[PDB]
Structures are given as structure tokens and as C-alpha cells.
Write a protein that binds this ligand. Structure first.
Ligand SMILES: Cc1c(Nc2nc(N)c3c(C#N)c(N4CCC[C@H]4C)n(C)c3n2)cnn1[C@@H]1CCOC1
Ligand SMILES: [Cl-]
Ligand SMILES: [Cl-]
Length: 261
């Protein structure tokens, strides 16, 4: 009810809906509430949200419906979003970026292990708790890619153009896991350079061509140290069947480099 919760401010607009800081009128407990005006989509999102139990995935509290409105309740992330830790044109200190990337991979390993693909990994959807632990949020595009140990291919275009893998723009059907790996590499670029490399990974985009031609003397690549850049060379591979897998990311030199807080 409008009687149990006070909507204090907008936190943002999700893939499908919008998120308010709600304060409990009785207890003053502060949560995040997703406000959904209108379906089969929301039933599927709630069901995926109920599956989730991991330190690097957002906590789901539950849901209420009142008419053509529905309410989803989640752990309010007191640290806000990763997006707000990225300084435009700078990024953030490499040790902070490595720790976030470790935590991002842990959450993605978890999701992939329960057969879920996120499909919209980007810094707006990566939240931080009071100890700066990263939480993967927004399951509005999430879907099953593995069930009874059998993989299904994706055949729907969605996500955010600067984060989408090139196969999603080109192939009728594609594997879910390499698409989420790609978007994690764009997140890593953003954290280390404070800029996105291209509007979209299409041959008509000059910045994408420049990367395929290995011009890493250009921005954002020249801002990035040789070790993390070597990892990005393995992640941002156009052919998803040649792209590095998460088990191999875990073996990468930069991924395993001790860095000072
Ligand atoms: C406490 C806090 C948050 N905390 C928070 N906690 C969530 N749980 C979500 C959440 C979800 N779920 C979400 N959004 C927006 C739409 C997509 C989704 C990820 N956003 C954006 C969420 N933000 C964000 N800023 N601040 C403060 C106030 C402004 O700066 C610091
Ligand atoms: Cl910006
Ligand atoms: Cl950015």
C-alpha cells in the first residue's frame, strides 16, 4: 500500500520499469522498490529473482501487486552503482578495477552455473554494498540458457549497444555465455579508461574497425596498462568460438597479479 512505504527518490529506470528508494512508514527500513506499470515478462523476472543466492548477486526480498502496478523489493545498495565510481576519461585505480572484476566474474560464474544469462551487464546494473562488494542487479532481460544439462541458443537481440557482443548483431542464434563475457570486457575497459570504445561492435563503426586492426596506440586502449590490455585482447575477440571463457580468464596474468589497495 501507499500506507506501508514512502517513495523518497528515483534510483533509475531499468530495462523494463523504474526503481525508487522506498522508506518503511513503520520501521524506516530503506529498500529498493522496482515499480512496474502493467506482464509474462514480470512473472519470469520474479521466478529468476527467487533462484538467486550469492554474495555478488542483488538480494530479492519479494513482490506485491496492486492492479496494473507491481512492486519488486530488493536490498538497497548503500554504495550506489559502479557507474558512479568511474571518473569520465580516467576510470579508477587499477587495484579497485581488478577487485570489482574479480567480484563480477564470481557473480557471472554463479549465474552461468545455475543456467542463467544476465544479457545486460553494464556499470549501471553493478551495485555496491557498504563494504564496496559488487552485486549484479536488474534481471529484467535474464533468461534460462541451460536446463536439464542441455544448452539452448539465444535468438533475441537485447542489451545495450556499446556492451553487446558482435554476434548478437549478426547471427540468428548465438551462445549466451560468450555474450556475457564480452559485456564484462567492456565493463573492464570502462573501469580502466573511463570511456567506452565504440557505439556498437559493427564494421560500420570506425572505432570497432580500429580495434580489429589492433590500433591500441588510440584511446581508450593507450590509457590501459599492457597486462589488463592483454586480457581485453582475449575477451574482445569477434568470433565467439575463439573468445576466452571464464575458466581461462581465471588463468590470465593480470587477473592473477597482486595489486596494492
Ligand atoms: C543507496 C543508493 C543506491 N542504491 C541502489 N540500490 C538498488 N538495489 C538499486 C537498483 C536495483 N535493483 C537500481 N537500478 C536502477 C534501475 C536498474 C537497477 C539496477 N539502482 C540504481 C539501485 N540503487 C543508488 N544510489 N544510492 C545513493 C543515492 C544516490 O547515490 C547514492
Ligand atoms: Cl558520462
Ligand atoms: Cl563509463
Amino acid at each position: 500500500f501507499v500506507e506501508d512505504w514512502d517513495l523518497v527518490q528515483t534510483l533509475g529506470e531499468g530495462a523494463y520499469g523504474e526503481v525508487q528508494l522506498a522508506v518503511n512508514r513503520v520501521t524506516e527500513e530503506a529498500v529498493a522498490v522496482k515499480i512496474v506499470d502493467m506482464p509474462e515478462n514480470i512473472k519470469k523476472e520474479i521466478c529468476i529473482l527467487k533462484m538467486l543466492n550469492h554474495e555478488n548477486v542483488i538480494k530479492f526480498y519479494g513482490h506485491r501487486r496492486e492492479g496494473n502496478i507491481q512492486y519488486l523489493f530488493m536490498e538497497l545498495a548503500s554504495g550506489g552503482s559502479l557507474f558512479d565510481r568511474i571518473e569520465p576519461d580516467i576510470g579508477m585505480p587499477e587495484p579497485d578495477a581488478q577487485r570489482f572484476f574479480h567480484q563480477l566474474m564470481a557473480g557471472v560464474v554463479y549465474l552461468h552455473g545455475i543456467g542463467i544469462t544476465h544479457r545486460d551487464i553494464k556499470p549501471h546494473n553493478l551495485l555496491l554494498d557498504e563494504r564496496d562488494n559488487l552485486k549484479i542487479a536488474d534481471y529484467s532481460l535474464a533468461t534460462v540458457f541451460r536446463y536439464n544439462n542441455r544448452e539452448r541458443l539465444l535468438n533475441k537481440m537485447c542489451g545495450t549497444l556499446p556492451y553487446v557482443a558482435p554476434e548478437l548483431l549478426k547471427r540468428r542464434e548465438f551462445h549466451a555465455e560468450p555474450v556475457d563475457v564480452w559485456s564484462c570486457g567492456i565493463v573492464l575497459t570502462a573501469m580502466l579508461a573511463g570511456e567506452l570504445p565504440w557505439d556498437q561492435p559493427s564494421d560500420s563503426c570506425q572505432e570497432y574497425s580500429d580495434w580489429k586492426e589492433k590500433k591500441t596506440y588510440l584511446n581508450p586502449w593507450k590509457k590501459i596498462d599492457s597486462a589488463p590490455l592483454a586480457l581485453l585482447h582475449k575477451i574482445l575477440v569477434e568470433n565467439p568460438s575463439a573468445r576466452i571463457t571464464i575458466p581461462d580468464i581465471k588463468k590470465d596474468r593480470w587477473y592473477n597479479k597482486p595489486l596494492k589497495k
